[PDB]
Amino acid sequence: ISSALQNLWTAAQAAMAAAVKAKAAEIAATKTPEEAKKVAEIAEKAIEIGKLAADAALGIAAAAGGKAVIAKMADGISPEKQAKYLAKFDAEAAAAKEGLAEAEKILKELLKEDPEAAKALTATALAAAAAAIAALL
């Protein structure tokens, strides 16, 4: 049902987090335990960045697809309903861009905490997110 789709998305997010944590273990192995704890916290925030970016990309793509669907159902539907659903979809895209802004907010502080670990963990998170987004679509 929608059950299995949510199970798929849950498992994809779990794979993303597992990739980020594997990279985090690689980084922490060359650090003191006291700095490795910091690496772990940066890894958690990078996992969050990856989830946000994936959700935002999916929302933007769904909104664009819906607006294209309305642009074919041209005079098949009244201009009033056209505007109704084009707006609903613009709000959908706006929420996705809000998620992107929050991801940027987190990335800027992670760069203010440890730029090299932030860069590596966020690159791993975004790559796992791209792989999941492509696998779903």
Author numbering: 5 to 141
Question: What does the primary publication say about this deposited structure?
Answer:
Pathogenic E. coli and Shigella spp. produce the outer membrane transporter ChuA, which binds host hemoglobin and extracts its heme cofactor, before importing heme into the cell. Heme extraction by ChuA is a dynamic process, with the transporter capable of rapidly extracting heme from hemoglobin in the absence of an external energy source, without forming a stable ChuA-hemoglobin complex. TBDTs consist of a 22-stranded transmembrane β-barrel with a pore occluded by a globular plug domain, which is transiently displaced during import. Using an AlphaFold2 model of ChuA as a target, we utilised RFdiffusion and ProteinMPNN to design binders targeting extracellular loops 7 and 8 of ChuA, which our model indicated were responsible for hemoglobin binding.
We expressed and purified four binders with the most prominent inhibition zones (A10, C8, G7 and H3). All binders inhibited αβHb and Mb-dependent growth of E. coliΔTBDT:ChuOP when spotted on agar, to a concentration of 250-500 nM for αβHb and 125-250 nM for Mb. To resolve how closely their computational design matches reality, we attempted to determine the crystal structures of A10, C8, G7 and H3 in isolation. Diffracting crystals were only obtained for binder C8, and the structure was solved at 2.46 Å. The crystal contained eight molecules per asymmetric unit, which have a pairwise similar RMSD of ~0.6 Å. This was comparable to the computational design of C8, which also had an RMSD of ~0.6 Å to the C8 molecules in the crystal structure, indicating that the predicted model closely matches the X-ray structure, once flexibility of the protein and experimental error are accounted for.
